[PDB]
Structure formats: structure tokens, C-alpha cells
Subunit: 132 residues, 2 copies
């Protein structure tokens, strides 16, 4: 089942934002040298992605997108299990975003697309959840 | 850029401070007024004392020209710092004396306060990055 959500504004702080479960508070992440180098940290049902700059950015969430991302500043792919219908995306002290992503297993690919590159003319993080 | 990292160094913090100073100098204890406290540092001569949250066995992570972002902290302080002779020390009151082979020159010295609750070392952690200028 293919789906694409409208772009959602998010204030990024501490060079990160986290994708996590609907009825859960995300755990403390272990930001090791490796985790920072890989561009993400994962723990107990959540993934924190490294963000390039602390600014109001757009989250562009997609489910099984047919569209390709031709160019990017960073590209990160991580496996992700969804326990309940819906996920949250949030940065430190930002508003909490919600997306009705179905239960199951996914490969989450996050493309960092700076304002310079983005069609939205602002730092854009494209997240495609591909049904495994 | 000349990149260099040091093994974490355990350090007993006393009087809510530790001090970065020149290889061959004896730094005084700084006047930690509400202003200096709010700033999170106090400088004098060729020495900078950084404010610590509490007196405990903390870890000092010293870095030279690191580009690794610090994703978790409760305080960030960036201060100009000149190294007179090749080498510096880090020390709290009556603690062990730490030593770091830092070349002569000017730096932008940044100190991140990472409390135990946020640190993967599970103890108050102070990350110190000397950026060459």
C-alpha cells in the first residue's frame, strides 16, 4: 500500500530527530563514535537520525515510494519494526509529529536534502518506509 | 585538518570546577560569581577553569579538531585559548594531573557538559575540543 504525506515542519535541535512508537517515550541513545559516523543511533523501538543543521526543517515521510532520490548530502538505511498503527517523529523540545504507518517491519531510508537542493527551499529530510 | 583523540580520563571534581592550563604554570582558583557561573567558565593568564555540575568522579574527553557532533549536553562553552608551549594540563583541586600533548598556537576551546544520565560512560562527562585557529 503506497502512501505519501504532506511535508511537515520540524524544529531540529542537537543535530538529531527521532522516529519512535506511538505509545512509547523514546529511550536515551548511545551516541558512540560509530553511531555518529553511521549517521544514526538505534535502541528499543526507536531510531535517532543525525541531522546536518539545527533549524526549522521539513520532514517528508513516504511509504513504499516509487519516486527516486537523485541527489543528497547523506543517505542512511536502517531496519525498523512498528508495534502499533502509527509512529512519532520529534526532535529535542520540538512539536511531536504523527504518521499513521501500519504495523510491521520496514527498511527506513533517510535522505538528508539541504535547502540548496530541496524543492521546498529548506532543509528537507526524506524518510521512505519500504515494506520488507 | 590535524585530528587527534585521547582516551577518556577519570578525574575527581572538587569545588565544582576543573582547569585547563599551560604545561609549566600554577593556576589559581577562579572567582565563581553568579555571572561566571552562568557563563560556565572563568579565565586568567593562560588558564581557563570550567564549571562542573557536581563534585564526583567525572570523565574528561579531550579532542583536537574533532568534527564529531555532540548530540547530548546541558552546557556548551566556547573560549579562545592560547597554548604558550607544546603541552597542557587539566586538573581539579587535589585531583590527579592530566596531560595532553597540544601544540603551540591559538585555539577555540569548547567544553560540553554531558551529565551521567546522558553519557554512555554513565558518569558526568566533559568533552573538550580544541579547534585550531
Amino acid at each position: 500500500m503506497i502512501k505519501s504525506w504532506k511535508p511537515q515542519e520540524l524544529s531540529i535541535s542537537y543535530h538529531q530527530f527521532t522516529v519512535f512508537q506511538k505509545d512509547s517515550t523514546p529511550p536515551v541513545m548511545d551516541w558512540t563514535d560509530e553511531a555518529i559516523e553511521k549517521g544514526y543511533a538505534a535502541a528499543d523501538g526507536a531510531i535517532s537520525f543525525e541531522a546536518q543543521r539545527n533549524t526549522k526543517a521539513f520532514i517528508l515521510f513516504r511509504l513504499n515510494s516509487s519516486e527516486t532520490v537523485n541527489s543528497y548530502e547523506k543517505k542512511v538505511t536502517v531496519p525498523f519494526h512498528v508495534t502499533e498503527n502509527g509512529i512519532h517523529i520529534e526532535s529535542i523540545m520540538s512539536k511531536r509529529l504523527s504518521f499513521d504507518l501500519p504495523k510491521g517491519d520496514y527498511q527506513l531510508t533517510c535522505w538528508t536534502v539541504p535547502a540548496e537542493m530541496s524543492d521546498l527551499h529548506a532543509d528537507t529530510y526524506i524518510i521512505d518506509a519500504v515494506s520488507v
